[PDB]
Amino acid sequence: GSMAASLVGKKIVFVTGNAKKLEEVVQILGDKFPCTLVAQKIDLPEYQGEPDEISIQKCQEAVRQVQGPVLVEDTCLCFNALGGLPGPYIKWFLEKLKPEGLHQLLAGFEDKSAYALCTFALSTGDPSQPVRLFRGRTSGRIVAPRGCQDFGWDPCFQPDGYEQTYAEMPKAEKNAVSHRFRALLELQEYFGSLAA
Amino acid sequence: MAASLVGKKIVFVTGNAKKLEEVVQILGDKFPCTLVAQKIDLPEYQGEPDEISIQKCQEAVRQVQGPVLVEDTCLCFNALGGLPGPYIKWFLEKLKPEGLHQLLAGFEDKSAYALCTFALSTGDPSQPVRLFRGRTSGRIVAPRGCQDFGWDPCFQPDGYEQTYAEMPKAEKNAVSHRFRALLELQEYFGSLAA
């Protein structure tokens, strides 16, 4: 042991379908991240359950495919008046309702607050090794959409700190409060900067 | 397919004997197979309702390696494109019947439907899952009737001025999405082999 150290200098499969998502991650993790991430498209179910338990189940199924170290990502958009929903089901709700409809879903609630959540889940592919989760959250409010509508649910999410939606914000300012950047910082810190 | 299950055990994935009893009564005396209740651990998948039921059935087949029957229920708000749909369990838990109704406050359309899907496989790997569905159209309302009855207090079926929760059992049965689904399953086997 440790788990982190067992992975230094090793390939970790990052589940994704395109090289630019790998590049984003690799840059954020920085040059002292002491493992080799390799992108591969692995066919995984999508699960219902609480965010952590979905993340864990998806990473376990990835281990059954890969049988070696693997890294998966999941992102939730959680409305506080709805008890954290749509949460992990946000894709479906964005698809059916659009940004404008995501906001409209809150018309009956005075509390417009929300948070964006990214979870990365990592496993060595075992012994006997529990999945480890790395999370990032950003608080904000659901608003009538602003900004370019191509950017998923970003038009309807205004992060605390700002008067701009994620869609309106320039990428370098979104990065500074991003839920995904925050999750990846937890992953980076887990491994430390002393091994590479 | 049906012809091949006549006379044979089909596992019905459930946790209680009472749930098996309701289904066996609805299907009637000439249903030609023997339903056996078994609690089989199955994941809860995301997707369109048919996808989820097929994926669930296929996992049940992976585990039972023989005939199996699974059930799934959705509550589908038309203003929301049919959501919460297969995610109704979570919406109910967080929001309760009152908050389910409050979810539609910004939408003029309150119409909805209840969906029940039963999924059957023989267990043979080459044979595809068959679905049997029933739907009940209605509206989402401020809840009325006994709060213990799941999401029933907020669903008023078309043809009645009462919610599911308010309705006497016999009356609910007359329009029930679940009865409708089981009729299609009954019809698949037919009433000639028993």
Side-chain angles (χ1 to χ4, degrees):
Chain A
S2 68
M3 209 273 222
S6 80
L7 291 184
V8 169
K10 314 259 184 110
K11 168 182 175 170
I12 303 175
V13 171
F14 178 41
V15 182
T16 197
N18 66 286
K20 214 67 183 163
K21 288 343 183 153
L22 177 81
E23 178 183 293
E24 290 166 10
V25 161
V26 169
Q27 287 187 359
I28 290 154
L29 288 175
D31 201 52
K32 296 201 165 315
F33 183 71
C35 312
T36 298
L37 301 174
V38 175
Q40 192 174 348
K41 182 77 182 187
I42 306 301
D43 195 348
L44 299 168
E46 274 261 298
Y47 298 93
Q48 309 175 36
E50 301 212 0
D52 273 14
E53 56 188 8
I54 284 167
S55 285
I56 296 172
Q57 189 167 17
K58 175 189 179 176
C59 185
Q60 289 170 357
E61 185 60 32
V63 169
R64 281 181 207 112
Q65 292 316 306
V66 184
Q67 285 172 39
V70 70
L71 184 63
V72 309
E73 181 177 7
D74 292 82
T75 297
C76 295
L77 181 65
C78 303
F79 297 0
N80 295 143
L82 310 186
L85 297 165
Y89 313 127
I90 183 69
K91 164 204 196 178
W92 310 108
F93 286 79
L94 167 73
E95 187 263 308
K96 303 277 188 233
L97 282 163
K98 315 316 170 165
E100 169 101 299
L102 291 168
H103 174 240
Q104 195 177 347
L105 196 63
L106 285 166
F109 304 86
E110 302 66 28
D111 178 12
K112 311 295 179 180
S113 70
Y115 59 95
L117 168 66
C118 170
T119 310
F120 281 83
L122 175 71
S123 170
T124 50
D126 252 320
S128 85
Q129 177 57 244
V131 170
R132 181 71 164 74
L133 302 185
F134 304 100
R135 299 173 208 78
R137 284 173 190 118
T138 307
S139 297
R141 267 190 132 232
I142 303 303
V143 304
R146 306 192 305 257
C148 166
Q149 299 276 20
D150 297 304
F151 299 149
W153 48 260
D154 278 21
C156 80
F157 185 70
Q158 180 185 305
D160 300 344
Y162 301 85
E163 294 197 331
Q164 302 109 256
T165 68
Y166 268 178
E168 287 179 286
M169 289 183 108
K171 201 186 147 188
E173 210 65 40
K174 184 188 157 189
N175 297 346
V177 292
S178 160
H179 52 288
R180 192 184 199 213
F181 280 60
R182 291 173 174 179
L184 288 163
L185 189 64
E186 291 323 293
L187 181 54
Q188 194 186 71
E189 189 275 351
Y190 178 75
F191 282 85
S193 303
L194 301 169
Chain B
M1 213 288 180
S4 66
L5 293 172
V6 174
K8 288 177 194 336
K9 160 203 223 188
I10 304 170
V11 163
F12 176 44
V13 173
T14 183
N16 151 248
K18 170 68 164 68
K19 281 208 55 149
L20 169 66
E21 186 194 275
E22 299 157 351
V23 176
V24 168
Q25 289 175 15
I26 301 169
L27 293 172
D29 180 75
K30 287 192 176 303
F31 184 73
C33 314
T34 303
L35 297 185
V36 177
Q38 192 179 352
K39 183 55 187 90
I40 308 288
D41 167 49
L42 293 177
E44 290 290 286
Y45 294 108
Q46 292 181 42
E48 320 222 322
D50 281 3
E51 290 177 329
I52 294 180
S53 286
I54 286 160
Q55 320 165 64
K56 185 181 274 192
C57 197
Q58 290 168 342
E59 172 66 12
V61 162
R62 174 191 150 277
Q63 294 196 237
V64 175
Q65 298 185 22
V68 59
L69 187 67
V70 301
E71 197 183 351
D72 281 316
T73 297
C74 304
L75 182 63
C76 301
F77 298 8
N78 288 320
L80 310 184
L83 299 162
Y87 313 119
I88 185 53
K89 162 183 120 200
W90 310 103
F91 279 79
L92 180 62
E93 189 47 24
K94 297 313 190 129
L95 307 186
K96 306 172 83 287
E98 304 66 6
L100 291 178
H101 177 241
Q102 199 167 347
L103 205 49
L104 286 174
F107 293 89
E108 288 286 55
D109 186 8
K110 315 301 186 181
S111 71
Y113 60 100
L115 171 71
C116 179
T117 303
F118 279 83
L120 179 63
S121 178
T122 58
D124 183 279
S126 240
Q127 298 175 269
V129 174
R130 209 179 278 266
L131 303 179
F132 307 97
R133 311 165 199 77
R135 293 188 181 75
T136 308
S137 75
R139 299 179 341 215
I140 311 308
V141 303
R144 301 176 314 261
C146 178
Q147 47 168 86
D148 307 322
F149 292 143
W151 47 257
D152 289 6
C154 70
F155 182 77
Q156 179 173 267
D158 296 340
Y160 301 88
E161 205 163 65
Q162 288 172 295
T163 67
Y164 267 178
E166 282 176 300
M167 288 168 73
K169 192 52 176 57
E171 281 176 38
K172 184 183 173 186
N173 291 350
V175 287
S176 170
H177 57 290
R178 195 169 173 245
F179 277 69
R180 286 163 177 190
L182 279 169
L183 191 66
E184 299 262 294
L185 170 65
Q186 184 196 77
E187 181 194 298
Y188 179 65
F189 283 95
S191 300
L192 295 163

